[PDB]
From a paper:
Inteins are protein elements that remove themselves from their precursor proteins in an autocatalytic pathway called protein splicing. The M86 mutant of the Ssp DnaB intein (here referred to as WT intein) was selected by sequential directed evolution for its more general activity and is one of the few known intein mutants with improved extein promiscuity.
The M86 mutant was previously selected by sequential directed evolution from the parent Ssp DnaB intein23 as a more general protein splicing catalyst with regard to the flanking amino acids, a highly desirable trait when choosing a ligation site. In summary, we have further investigated the high sequence promiscuity of the M86 intein and reported its crystal structure. When the WT and M86 intein are compared, slight changes of the backbone φ-, ψ- and ω-angles are observed at the N-terminal splice junction, which may correlate with the altered activity of the M86 mutant. The carbonyl group of the scissile peptide bond is slightly shifted between the two structures, a finding that is also reflected by differences in the ω-angle. This angle is closer to 180° of the perfect trans conformation for the M86 intein.
Numbering used by the authors: -6 to -1, 1 to 109, 116 to 160
């Protein structure tokens, strides 16, 4: 059994752990060996992880996902997000379902100061937007990264 890998809009802003800035994934095309923020599901802590490659799978239909806090991203229907019950494709998600947001951001204060590295935010809407070039990252090990301040699954590498 092979799962099908997802992709996100080129406008998605990727958080660079070392640089501390956010760059659209389209600008990282062809780049490698740079650091991103990813969640370790076991420890549930945010770690710095290296990207092995950035690639484009062409023009595909993307959907806009919005959360209660206003986090937004455009992704293919098969792209996976982190829920309480594990990774779920965009077309598997239900309204009011919680997805993982990083608490650590490129700011002085954490996400929810008033009250361990993840904030669970409900989905308010998923809407079909249109067709545009979509990209993904390969993150050996953790296999996820922060895009538009949302935890998103990285490329699904299929050795076999």
């Amino acid at each position: 059994m092979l799962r099908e890998s997802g992709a996100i809009s080129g406008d998605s802003l990727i958080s660079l752990a070392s640089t501390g800035k956010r760059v659209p994934i389209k600008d990282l095309l062809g780049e490698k060996d740079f650091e991103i923020w990813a969640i370790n599901e076991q420890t549930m802590k945010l770690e710095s992880a290296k990207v092995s490659r950035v690639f484009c799978t062409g023009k595909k239909l993307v959907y806009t996902l919005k959360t209660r806090l206003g986090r937004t991203i455009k992704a293919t229907a098969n792209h996976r997000f982190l829920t309480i019950d594990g990774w779920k494709r965009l077309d598997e998600l239900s309204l009011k379902e919680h997805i993982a947001l990083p608490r650590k951001l490129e700011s002085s204060s954490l996400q929810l100061a008033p009250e361990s590295d993840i904030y669970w935010d409900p989905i308010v809407s998923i809407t079909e937007t249109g067709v545009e070039e979509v990209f993904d990252l390969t993150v050996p090990g953790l296999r996820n990264f922060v895009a538009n301040d949302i935890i998103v699954h990285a490329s699904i590498e299929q050795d076999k």
